[PDB]
Amino acid sequence: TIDVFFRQSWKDERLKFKGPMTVLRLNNLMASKIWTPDTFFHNGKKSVAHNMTMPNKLLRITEDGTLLYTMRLTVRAECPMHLEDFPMDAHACPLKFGSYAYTRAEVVYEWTREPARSV
Amino acid sequence: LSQVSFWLNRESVPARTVFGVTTVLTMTTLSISARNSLPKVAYATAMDWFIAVCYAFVFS
Amino acid sequence: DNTTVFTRILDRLLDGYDNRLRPGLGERVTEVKTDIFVTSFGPVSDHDMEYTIDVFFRQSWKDERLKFKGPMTVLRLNNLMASKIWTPDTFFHNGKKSVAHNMTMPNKLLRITEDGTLLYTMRLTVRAECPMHLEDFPMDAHACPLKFGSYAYTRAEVVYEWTREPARSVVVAEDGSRLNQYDLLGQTVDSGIVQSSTGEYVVMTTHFHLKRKIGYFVIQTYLPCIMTVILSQVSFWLNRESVPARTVFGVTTVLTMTTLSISARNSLPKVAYATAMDWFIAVCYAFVFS
Amino acid sequence: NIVMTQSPKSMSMSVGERVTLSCKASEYVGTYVSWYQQKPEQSPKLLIYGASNRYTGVPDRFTGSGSATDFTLTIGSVQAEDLADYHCGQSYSYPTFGAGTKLEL
Amino acid sequence: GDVTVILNNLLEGYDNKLRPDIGVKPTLIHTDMYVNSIGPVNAINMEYTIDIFFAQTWYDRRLKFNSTIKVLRLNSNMVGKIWIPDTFFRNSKKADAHWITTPNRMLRIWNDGRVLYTLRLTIDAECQLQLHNFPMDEHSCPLEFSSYGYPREEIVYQWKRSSVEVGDTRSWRLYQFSFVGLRNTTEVVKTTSGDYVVMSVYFDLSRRMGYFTIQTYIPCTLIVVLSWVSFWINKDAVPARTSLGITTVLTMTTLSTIARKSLPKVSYVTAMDLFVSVCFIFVFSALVEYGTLHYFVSSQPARAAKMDSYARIFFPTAFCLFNLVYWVSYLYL
Amino acid sequence: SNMSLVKETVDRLLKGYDIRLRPDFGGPPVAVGMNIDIASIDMVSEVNMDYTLTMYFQQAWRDKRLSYNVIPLNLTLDNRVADQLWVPDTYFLNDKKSFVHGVTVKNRMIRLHPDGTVLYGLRITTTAACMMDLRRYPLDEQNCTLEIESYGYTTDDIEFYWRGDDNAVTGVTKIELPQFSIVDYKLITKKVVFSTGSYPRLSLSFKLKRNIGYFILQTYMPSILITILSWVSFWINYDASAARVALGITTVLT
Amino acid sequence: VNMDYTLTMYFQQAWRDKRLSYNVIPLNLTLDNRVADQLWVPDTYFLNDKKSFVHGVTVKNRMIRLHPDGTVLYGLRITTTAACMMDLRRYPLDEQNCTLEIESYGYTTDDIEFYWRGDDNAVTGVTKIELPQFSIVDYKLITKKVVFSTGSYPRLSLSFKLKRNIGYFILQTYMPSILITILSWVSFWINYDASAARVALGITTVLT
Ligand SMILES: *[C@@H]1O[C@H](CO)[C@@H](O[C@@H]2O[C@H](CO)[C@@H](O[C@@H]3O[C@H](CO[C@H]4O[C@H](CO[C@H]5O[C@H](CO)[C@@H](O)[C@H](O)[C@@H]5O[C@H]5O[C@H](CO)[C@@H](O)[C@H](O)[C@@H]5O)[C@@H](O)[C@H](O[C@H]5O[C@H](CO)[C@@H](O)[C@H](O)[C@@H]5O)[C@@H]4O)[C@@H](O)[C@H](O[C@H]4O[C@H](CO)[C@@H](O)[C@H](O)[C@@H]4O[C@H]4O[C@H](CO)[C@@H](O)[C@H](O)[C@@H]4O[C@H]4O[C@H](CO)[C@@H](O)[C@H](O)[C@@H]4O)[C@@H]3O)[C@H](O)[C@H]2NC(C)=O)[C@H](O)[C@H]1NC(C)=O
Ligand SMILES: *[C@@H]1O[C@H](CO)[C@@H](O[C@@H]2O[C@H](CO)[C@@H](O[C@@H]3O[C@H](CO[C@H]4O[C@H](CO)[C@@H](O)[C@H](O)[C@@H]4O)[C@@H](O)[C@H](O[C@H]4O[C@H](CO)[C@@H](O)[C@H](O)[C@@H]4O)[C@@H]3O)[C@H](O)[C@H]2NC(C)=O)[C@H](O)[C@H]1NC(C)=O
Ligand SMILES: *[C@@H]1O[C@H](CO)[C@@H](O[C@@H]2O[C@H](CO)[C@@H](O[C@@H]3O[C@H](CO[C@H]4O[C@H](CO)[C@@H](O)[C@H](O)[C@@H]4O)[C@@H](O)[C@H](O[C@H]4O[C@H](CO)[C@@H](O)[C@H](O)[C@@H]4O)[C@@H]3O)[C@H](O)[C@H]2NC(C)=O)[C@H](O)[C@H]1NC(C)=O
Ligand SMILES: *[C@@H]1O[C@H](CO)[C@@H](O[C@@H]2O[C@H](CO)[C@@H](O[C@@H]3O[C@H](CO[C@H]4O[C@H](CO)[C@@H](O)[C@H](O)[C@@H]4O)[C@@H](O)[C@H](O[C@H]4O[C@H](CO)[C@@H](O)[C@H](O)[C@@H]4O)[C@@H]3O)[C@H](O)[C@H]2NC(C)=O)[C@H](O)[C@H]1NC(C)=O
Ligand SMILES: *[C@@H]1O[C@H](CO)[C@@H](O[C@@H]2O[C@H](CO)[C@@H](O)[C@H](O)[C@H]2NC(C)=O)[C@H](O)[C@H]1NC(C)=O
Ligand SMILES: *[C@@H]1O[C@H](CO)[C@@H](O[C@@H]2O[C@H](CO)[C@@H](O)[C@H](O)[C@H]2NC(C)=O)[C@H](O)[C@H]1NC(C)=O
Ligand SMILES: Cc1ccc(-n2c(-c3ccccc3)nc3ccccc3c2=O)cc1
């Protein structure tokens, strides 16, 4: 089990604005009205999105149309273990995520910072 | 404890018999319990080999 | 077109109706008559200090905005009419987790009389917290409470009242007993007031009096302990020229007592004091050791 | 039924003193006992409902207390208009009334 | 820009309460299954878990458009606005779609009105395990699905040529069992509602006898040889041999309890508990044999003397013979 | 085109439909026929005093509002239209926890017939309470049941009956339980009185007999065998105190 | 085993919204709870909670109460299973300190400000809590600002100091083992001519 803030950020030109605020710290319900990526966990078993006391989500629209979208999850993921050296065993538990429904010709994912600093 | 039995005199038969019997029963219990904690994998772990060798020593 | 005229009645009834406002919002206190029918009294969890209960929760009040005139004196309406009107926001104070059943449809009921009286009945299961004192376990008795009242409406706005004589307002069905380990001696009701940090609220209380049955514990702990004591004392009649035999008697009886003492507590919560069963086992262990 | 034993049968006290009327319930009645003041040739008037709840128009000297089987009505600093009979009743079950208590000077 | 126009024109005046070809001909649905993993197979509840990607494709002439765009690649947003087949899994104790971070669903509509609809599912599928020959037991148990309300005259399912595809099988959660193959099937079942086309996928699982070996077979035979050890102890040491036998018996009963607790409470006899029962009979035989030997000491010394040596050989030979018969019969079945 | 005809027919049927009123709202009771196809009985638990069954629960009634005569076919509709039509408020009184299966869609069916007959099915899993008398356990027989009742509509508003009256329930003989055998089952029709009126009720009940072999092997045999091994002490000479006491004490421990 | 405690509370929030100001009515409007779906409420969450819910019988257990100046009192009955990492090095003579972290998910510290109404009496009912195995020895309220890569956020911490009662363990594990050791000592009073008896004592004691 892993609890994360899962942050995604993409550019939507259709959401450019010009106002007194440079950033719109918007409610978690605005995100439902816009396109968001349909990220999913390839090895996820049963994950939960928390909505106590309200949906634990976040949407921040910059004036240039850059979106920041974060959500709080508990992810449960398969970690196939090889227990031959048990209990002297070490494991590498994966966490694979990607886009359902969008191929590499339509949606690509990249780490926001240097890959070594992005988790 | 099983090896302690070697220092008892050859006349105290029930004593050494109890040592052997109880040590083997303990090892069987210890083997079941140590297998409890794990997923029911079909192969032998390092703990399984250590338990098997200790059981072999007690039986010997 | 009898359905059409009744549709016209229902539409005229909800026209300009604000379900956000209780009946008599600024000029009167809403009086909710309450009734409970216990279709089953679920099991009692000693470890969790709780008990389950299935009920028909019946609430009746008067809404002057819902007066009507037609060929009927009552309207037996599908339970989706209740969501369009004001209903009381009753909750169980010591409820841990309850469920409003909705298979195959929301297990609800709404009758509107032409004078504006409403009857609103729900089927629901309540897991409620029952604080227990186990100093006399397993020969103990408890009064498990069920407390309900309004959330967010203080005594000046909504008050609760038993629909019938208080002594007859909580009714338990004859065959409705899911009690394995206990006996339901009877029920008691009362009404009162609790001061919260948000105001003064009416609370309605029911106490269900339960007496534990000792049989399980007799067979599982008391008879084994007495048997081990008897066996320990039987070793006295053996000859003194049999040291191994009496040693085996003593050690095995002590081992059995230790196993029984570990087993006995496992059924009860981990309270910090000694119960009657604990004292009995302690004396039996003392006799075996002696 | 539920028997409400009200004591004393009668009692007298001057003006200005504190008195305590008591009513005993046979079974459990919770807080469902009410106190009634009945002046001569008049109908009863509700003073205390619940068990400790002054009915509207009841002066602040009257006050009730008690739960379960034991109940009491203390009239602090009685005046001259407090001379009447005082009945206790339970409404937990079908109502029953105490035999009454007469108050003289 | 103009994909919005295409989408708005497709959905305008469209009724998703009506299947395509409502009163003309049955809707044909081609189904594909990608099996991510076949989860643990717990015989206690007689069920197994499976995670799949379930693809369905059908034609809707109402979802027909003309543009330079050949395919509309959509997410789950538009799934609820068109007609979707009501496919359900018939032997599923419970099942669920996936919803993080969004519904794991996919919709693609082609130029000619072909629709592809995929979603990710984890299913607890019921299958009745005949546990005779356990733990040398092999099973082939199904995953059945059909339409809930549409009989054969309205919806017909059809396996594609390469319909069911499995992944690696190295990362699956099969411990007691190994996946050995699969097959697909179609048929028609009669119900109070009508005749329904029912699709079935059978997964062949064979139990691997490595956990049960070290958990039950080795301890039981070791307890049996421990019982044998008594035959070499001096016949005069009565407490030693009595305690040896009786402790062997209690260890045997504990082992039997655990081994049978492995699986559900079935009234018939499995291969494992036949083995355990024979081991118990052997230990009981050793103890009663010592009792009879000691009894005959007082009557006839030569009888007991030769009885000890006779048992020393008749017990291990009988156990080896029983082992041979048991393993030959059960392994070659 | 027949699609246009069906579309206009369904639109007309759903136009001006008042979901808040039952069929024949002011008139005689609407009669609902019940069918049950039992898929499985899952976990007969003595600890929780309950059991789980999965069934295809089907209800049928006449709704003159949903009648059509322009097309000759029975209209199976997407099961979302069930949220727009009146359906009976059937509930199971003794069920502890239930759900309708929801993969890949909510497993319910809604089928219209030209004369107004609605056919409304649900795939349901209910954990139903069943108090078991364990006095003769494991040589005991259990009689559990599912109670089917209307919640809001009294008996003058609605009538319940089994469709077939003996073939209304199917799939019982196909049920295999690891520990029990289904002796038989009955279908009962009755009315129950509450403070708020009298309501229709259907009872389906099963008689379950427990299998003995499992208990024989696991708990009976060992008891006889320990008793016989305790007897073995009589053939040991009284001189061997340690041997006989070890035998007896160990048998007591087992 | 799960390293977590379950607490049920009445969680109240208060702020001011000038949009919801009224002057024709003199009294405080308690509205049906369903209007809270139509108002702005803070996006408060509990960082360490694992599973939580608002009680929903007979209706959702939430309170909405407006005041003429625009103040909104927002109340919820919540049960949270908060993560409670425990150090068991002194078990069962251990004192545990786990807490509830209250933070705004989306609003940084320049959008929203958290504080305890009362600042010392903001939390009630602690002295009336009866845990069978523990006793609440102390509780504290803290106001912090926490820094993430997405900004800095107001945080309130409610902590509890739990002292574990030991009597149960005396009855369960300490006394039996002490008595078993006393039993072990009996071996030295038995004549050292007896092998079966003394070995019986020692082996039985070890196994017990
Ligand atoms: C007895 O009472 C029970 C309790 O009330 C009751 O159970 C409830 O049933 C209802 C209906 O059957 C359920 O509501 C549906 O839920 C579907 C999702 O189901 C999964 O998720 C829910 C939780 O839902 C969250 O997640 C989805 C997607 O992730 C969101 O869409 C939801 O809004 C919600 O998200 C909020 O909460 C999150 C936190 O969880 C937040 O992070 C988030 O930000 C939001 O705040 C689970 O509860 C489900 O589990 C339960 O059910 C499964 C079934 O197998 C069980 O196994 C399990 O144990 C649980 O019991 C499940 O995991 C929704 O998809 C669905 O809404 C769609 O359909 C309806 C009807 O068609 C539409 O009206 C609705 O608008 C939605 O359609 C839109 O979205 C779909 C998405 O694919 C589009 O395809 C579609 O075209 C349409 O798009 C339109 O709107 C879009 C915006 O939404 C827009 O983008 C488009 O452009 C377009 O405009 C429906 O809400 C409810 O969850 C059940 N609750 C519980 C506790 O079970 C039970 O049925 C009763 N029984 C009986 C017999 O009556
Ligand atoms: C599991 O457990 C349930 C619950 O006990 C059992 O269900 C019972 O089944 C029996 C057999 O069907 C039911 O008995 C029936 O009761 C009916 C109602 O009787 C009243 O009304 C009639 C007139 O309507 C009066 O004659 C009578 O005095 C009562 O006032 C009877 O109508 C049934 O027939 C009786 O009358 C006819 C005509 O005289 C006779 O020919 C019959 O022989 C019989 O005498 C019958 O008596 C019983 O009511 C059910 N119980 C409940 C609670 O519903 C299950 O059978 C059991 N096992 C299984 C496998 O389900
Ligand atoms: C995580 O937490 C969030 C926030 O706490 C939850 O979000 C709430 O979800 C519920 C249920 O989906 C929402 O309630 C719904 O309100 C909808 C709209 O109500 C307004 O608008 C309509 C006009 O369309 C007006 O009629 C109404 O007066 C309101 O002004 C309705 O569409 C829904 O109605 C449904 O139920 C009612 C019950 O009577 C029926 O009448 C309908 O037919 C329909 O079935 C419903 O009332 C609520 O508004 C959401 N909150 C917010 C702030 O948006 C998430 O649901 C939660 N996640 C999970 C998984 O629980
Ligand atoms: C259960 O467990 C929790 C979590 O571990 C404990 O919570 C801690 O409580 C202590 C005290 O209650 C907190 O310490 C406080 O920190 C405040 C902020 O620190 C700033 O200033 C200091 C320098 O003074 C810097 O080093 C620091 O980086 C911050 O910039 C202090 O203001 C508090 O007061 C201190 O200063 C005043 C000055 O007047 C002194 O009078 C005080 O005595 C004190 O020295 C105090 O130091 C600590 O922050 C909390 N932890 C967390 C994570 O927030 C619970 O106390 C513990 N027990 C119970 C019963 O729950
Ligand atoms: C899955 O089903 C398909 C079709 O029912 C099977 O494909 C057929 O395979 C046979 C060879 O056995 C060919 O002669 C047919 O031409 C194939 N049909 C199609 C439509 O491709 C396939 O064998 C099944 N997969 C199994 C059983 O594993
Ligand atoms: C509405 O609520 C406010 C505050 O809860 C009430 O104002 C309080 O009135 C009481 C009684 O006079 C005083 O003790 C407090 O000092 C007041 N507090 C504040 C913050 O003003 C107000 O009275 C309530 N409205 C009504 C009609 O009672
Ligand atoms: C069903 C059942 C319940 C309890 C017992 N039991 C009886 C015992 C007590 C009274 C009569 C017969 C046996 N003594 C014991 C003495 C020492 C340790 C365990 C037991 C025991 O577990 C046996 C069977």
PDB file of N, CA, C and O and ligand atoms in Angstrom, chain A residues 28-29 49-55, chain C residues 80 83-84, chain G residues 34 36-39 41 60 74, ligand 3:
ATOM      1  N   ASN A  28     -12.112  21.701  -6.419  1.00  0.00           N
ATOM      2  CA  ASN A  28     -11.958  20.356  -6.952  1.00  0.00           C
ATOM      3  C   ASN A  28     -13.065  19.964  -7.921  1.00  0.00           C
ATOM      4  O   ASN A  28     -12.936  18.934  -8.589  1.00  0.00           O
ATOM      5  N   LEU A  29     -14.137  20.748  -8.025  1.00  0.00           N
ATOM      6  CA  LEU A  29     -15.244  20.409  -8.909  1.00  0.00           C
ATOM      7  C   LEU A  29     -15.120  21.025 -10.295  1.00  0.00           C
ATOM      8  O   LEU A  29     -15.818  20.589 -11.215  1.00  0.00           O
ATOM      9  N   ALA A  49      -9.772   6.989  -4.041  1.00  0.00           N
ATOM     10  CA  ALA A  49      -9.627   8.436  -4.026  1.00  0.00           C
ATOM     11  C   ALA A  49     -10.415   8.975  -2.843  1.00  0.00           C
ATOM     12  O   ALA A  49     -11.612   8.706  -2.715  1.00  0.00           O
ATOM     13  N   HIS A  50      -9.746   9.732  -1.985  1.00  0.00           N
ATOM     14  CA  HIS A  50     -10.355  10.212  -0.756  1.00  0.00           C
ATOM     15  C   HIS A  50     -11.220  11.435  -1.030  1.00  0.00           C
ATOM     16  O   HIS A  50     -10.802  12.348  -1.745  1.00  0.00           O
ATOM     17  N   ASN A  51     -12.431  11.448  -0.477  1.00  0.00           N
ATOM     18  CA  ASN A  51     -13.299  12.623  -0.537  1.00  0.00           C
ATOM     19  C   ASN A  51     -13.869  12.914   0.846  1.00  0.00           C
ATOM     20  O   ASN A  51     -15.058  13.179   1.021  1.00  0.00           O
ATOM     21  N   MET A  52     -13.001  12.874   1.853  1.00  0.00           N
ATOM     22  CA  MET A  52     -13.304  13.342   3.199  1.00  0.00           C
ATOM     23  C   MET A  52     -12.411  14.540   3.497  1.00  0.00           C
ATOM     24  O   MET A  52     -11.190  14.430   3.374  1.00  0.00           O
ATOM     25  N   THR A  53     -12.987  15.676   3.893  1.00  0.00           N
ATOM     26  CA  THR A  53     -14.420  15.915   4.010  1.00  0.00           C
ATOM     27  C   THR A  53     -15.013  16.260   2.647  1.00  0.00           C
ATOM     28  O   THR A  53     -16.222  16.247   2.463  1.00  0.00           O
ATOM     29  N   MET A  54     -14.139  16.573   1.698  1.00  0.00           N
ATOM     30  CA  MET A  54     -14.494  16.892   0.323  1.00  0.00           C
ATOM     31  C   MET A  54     -13.525  16.142  -0.580  1.00  0.00           C
ATOM     32  O   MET A  54     -12.509  15.640  -0.091  1.00  0.00           O
ATOM     33  N   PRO A  55     -13.793  16.021  -1.878  1.00  0.00           N
ATOM     34  CA  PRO A  55     -12.806  15.390  -2.767  1.00  0.00           C
ATOM     35  C   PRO A  55     -11.408  15.961  -2.585  1.00  0.00           C
ATOM     36  O   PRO A  55     -11.203  17.171  -2.710  1.00  0.00           O
TER      37      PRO A  55
ATOM     38  N   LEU C  80     -39.767   8.137  -2.931  1.00  0.00           N
ATOM     39  CA  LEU C  80     -39.038   9.247  -3.529  1.00  0.00           C
ATOM     40  C   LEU C  80     -39.753  10.581  -3.357  1.00  0.00           C
ATOM     41  O   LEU C  80     -39.199  11.617  -3.735  1.00  0.00           O
ATOM     42  N   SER C  83     -37.943  12.609  -0.397  1.00  0.00           N
ATOM     43  CA  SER C  83     -36.784  13.424  -0.725  1.00  0.00           C
ATOM     44  C   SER C  83     -37.171  14.811  -1.216  1.00  0.00           C
ATOM     45  O   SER C  83     -36.319  15.701  -1.245  1.00  0.00           O
ATOM     46  N   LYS C  84     -38.425  15.020  -1.594  1.00  0.00           N
ATOM     47  CA  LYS C  84     -38.878  16.314  -2.079  1.00  0.00           C
ATOM     48  C   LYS C  84     -39.463  17.195  -0.986  1.00  0.00           C
ATOM     49  O   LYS C  84     -39.782  18.356  -1.253  1.00  0.00           O
TER      50      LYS C  84
ATOM     51  N   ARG G  34     -29.070  19.351   3.219  1.00  0.00           N
ATOM     52  CA  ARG G  34     -28.804  19.209   1.795  1.00  0.00           C
ATOM     53  C   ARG G  34     -28.425  20.520   1.121  1.00  0.00           C
ATOM     54  O   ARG G  34     -27.971  20.489  -0.026  1.00  0.00           O
ATOM     55  N   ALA G  36     -25.973  22.316   2.051  1.00  0.00           N
ATOM     56  CA  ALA G  36     -24.518  22.378   2.081  1.00  0.00           C
ATOM     57  C   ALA G  36     -23.902  21.983   0.748  1.00  0.00           C
ATOM     58  O   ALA G  36     -22.760  22.360   0.470  1.00  0.00           O
ATOM     59  N   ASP G  37     -24.625  21.223  -0.075  1.00  0.00           N
ATOM     60  CA  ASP G  37     -24.158  20.904  -1.418  1.00  0.00           C
ATOM     61  C   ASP G  37     -24.171  22.109  -2.344  1.00  0.00           C
ATOM     62  O   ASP G  37     -23.648  22.017  -3.457  1.00  0.00           O
ATOM     63  N   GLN G  38     -24.769  23.219  -1.920  1.00  0.00           N
ATOM     64  CA  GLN G  38     -24.940  24.403  -2.747  1.00  0.00           C
ATOM     65  C   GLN G  38     -24.114  25.573  -2.231  1.00  0.00           C
ATOM     66  O   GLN G  38     -24.262  26.688  -2.730  1.00  0.00           O
ATOM     67  N   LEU G  39     -23.256  25.343  -1.240  1.00  0.00           N
ATOM     68  CA  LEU G  39     -22.466  26.387  -0.611  1.00  0.00           C
ATOM     69  C   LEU G  39     -20.996  26.012  -0.682  1.00  0.00           C
ATOM     70  O   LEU G  39     -20.640  24.839  -0.807  1.00  0.00           O
ATOM     71  N   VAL G  41     -17.698  25.180   1.065  1.00  0.00           N
ATOM     72  CA  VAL G  41     -17.196  24.688   2.341  1.00  0.00           C
ATOM     73  C   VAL G  41     -15.699  24.475   2.173  1.00  0.00           C
ATOM     74  O   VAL G  41     -15.237  24.234   1.052  1.00  0.00           O
ATOM     75  N   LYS G  60     -27.772  12.296   6.165  1.00  0.00           N
ATOM     76  CA  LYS G  60     -26.363  12.590   6.368  1.00  0.00           C
ATOM     77  C   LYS G  60     -26.200  13.440   7.619  1.00  0.00           C
ATOM     78  O   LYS G  60     -26.882  14.453   7.788  1.00  0.00           O
ATOM     79  N   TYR G  74     -20.582  24.837  10.161  1.00  0.00           N
ATOM     80  CA  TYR G  74     -20.656  23.616   9.373  1.00  0.00           C
ATOM     81  C   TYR G  74     -20.190  22.457  10.238  1.00  0.00           C
ATOM     82  O   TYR G  74     -19.071  22.476  10.754  1.00  0.00           O
TER      83      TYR G  74
HETATM   84  C1  LIG H   3     -17.321  12.635  -2.461  1.00  0.00           C
HETATM   85  O1  LIG H   3     -17.745  13.847  -1.826  1.00  0.00           O
HETATM   86  C2  LIG H   3     -18.451  14.744  -2.704  1.00  0.00           C
HETATM   87  C3  LIG H   3     -18.753  15.997  -1.915  1.00  0.00           C
HETATM   88  O2  LIG H   3     -19.019  15.706  -0.550  1.00  0.00           O
HETATM   89  C4  LIG H   3     -19.707  14.073  -3.263  1.00  0.00           C
HETATM   90  O3  LIG H   3     -20.362  14.945  -4.178  1.00  0.00           O
HETATM   91  C5  LIG H   3     -21.798  14.986  -4.005  1.00  0.00           C
HETATM   92  O4  LIG H   3     -22.455  13.941  -4.735  1.00  0.00           O
HETATM   93  C6  LIG H   3     -23.881  13.946  -4.548  1.00  0.00           C
HETATM   94  C7  LIG H   3     -24.416  12.732  -5.269  1.00  0.00           C
HETATM   95  O5  LIG H   3     -23.874  12.633  -6.578  1.00  0.00           O
HETATM   96  C8  LIG H   3     -24.453  15.258  -5.083  1.00  0.00           C
HETATM   97  O6  LIG H   3     -25.866  15.292  -4.903  1.00  0.00           O
HETATM   98  C9  LIG H   3     -26.530  15.380  -6.188  1.00  0.00           C
HETATM   99  O7  LIG H   3     -26.913  16.694  -6.512  1.00  0.00           O
HETATM  100  C10 LIG H   3     -27.200  16.786  -7.914  1.00  0.00           C
HETATM  101  C11 LIG H   3     -27.552  18.216  -8.291  1.00  0.00           C
HETATM  102  O8  LIG H   3     -28.204  18.849  -7.183  1.00  0.00           O
HETATM  103  C12 LIG H   3     -28.333  20.267  -7.450  1.00  0.00           C
HETATM  104  O9  LIG H   3     -28.787  20.524  -8.766  1.00  0.00           O
HETATM  105  C13 LIG H   3     -30.077  20.014  -9.126  1.00  0.00           C
HETATM  106  C14 LIG H   3     -30.265  20.467 -10.553  1.00  0.00           C
HETATM  107  O10 LIG H   3     -29.670  19.495 -11.405  1.00  0.00           O
HETATM  108  C15 LIG H   3     -31.135  20.638  -8.231  1.00  0.00           C
HETATM  109  O11 LIG H   3     -32.287  19.874  -8.493  1.00  0.00           O
HETATM  110  C16 LIG H   3     -30.767  20.470  -6.749  1.00  0.00           C
HETATM  111  O12 LIG H   3     -31.678  21.286  -6.054  1.00  0.00           O
HETATM  112  C17 LIG H   3     -29.337  20.899  -6.436  1.00  0.00           C
HETATM  113  O13 LIG H   3     -29.346  22.321  -6.526  1.00  0.00           O
HETATM  114  C18 LIG H   3     -28.353  15.816  -8.325  1.00  0.00           C
HETATM  115  O14 LIG H   3     -28.235  15.523  -9.707  1.00  0.00           O
HETATM  116  C19 LIG H   3     -28.388  14.477  -7.536  1.00  0.00           C
HETATM  117  O15 LIG H   3     -29.729  14.030  -7.507  1.00  0.00           O
HETATM  118  C20 LIG H   3     -29.748  12.594  -7.409  1.00  0.00           C
HETATM  119  O16 LIG H   3     -30.344  12.182  -6.216  1.00  0.00           O
HETATM  120  C21 LIG H   3     -31.552  12.910  -5.962  1.00  0.00           C
HETATM  121  C22 LIG H   3     -32.033  12.551  -4.573  1.00  0.00           C
HETATM  122  O17 LIG H   3     -33.308  13.139  -4.389  1.00  0.00           O
HETATM  123  C23 LIG H   3     -32.593  12.587  -7.074  1.00  0.00           C
HETATM  124  O18 LIG H   3     -33.657  13.513  -6.978  1.00  0.00           O
HETATM  125  C24 LIG H   3     -31.976  12.663  -8.517  1.00  0.00           C
HETATM  126  O19 LIG H   3     -32.840  12.011  -9.421  1.00  0.00           O
HETATM  127  C25 LIG H   3     -30.574  12.062  -8.579  1.00  0.00           C
HETATM  128  O20 LIG H   3     -30.755  10.640  -8.509  1.00  0.00           O
HETATM  129  C26 LIG H   3     -27.806  14.570  -6.121  1.00  0.00           C
HETATM  130  O21 LIG H   3     -28.775  15.222  -5.316  1.00  0.00           O
HETATM  131  C27 LIG H   3     -23.808  16.409  -4.327  1.00  0.00           C
HETATM  132  O22 LIG H   3     -24.293  17.650  -4.827  1.00  0.00           O
HETATM  133  C28 LIG H   3     -22.300  16.337  -4.499  1.00  0.00           C
HETATM  134  N1  LIG H   3     -21.659  17.426  -3.782  1.00  0.00           N
HETATM  135  C29 LIG H   3     -21.141  18.497  -4.390  1.00  0.00           C
HETATM  136  C30 LIG H   3     -20.528  19.525  -3.492  1.00  0.00           C
HETATM  137  O23 LIG H   3     -21.156  18.622  -5.606  1.00  0.00           O
HETATM  138  C31 LIG H   3     -19.334  12.760  -3.940  1.00  0.00           C
HETATM  139  O24 LIG H   3     -20.508  12.065  -4.341  1.00  0.00           O
HETATM  140  C32 LIG H   3     -18.536  11.885  -2.983  1.00  0.00           C
HETATM  141  N2  LIG H   3     -18.142  10.642  -3.624  1.00  0.00           N
HETATM  142  C33 LIG H   3     -18.613   9.449  -3.252  1.00  0.00           C
HETATM  143  C34 LIG H   3     -18.087   8.276  -4.010  1.00  0.00           C
HETATM  144  O25 LIG H   3     -19.426   9.324  -2.344  1.00  0.00           O
END
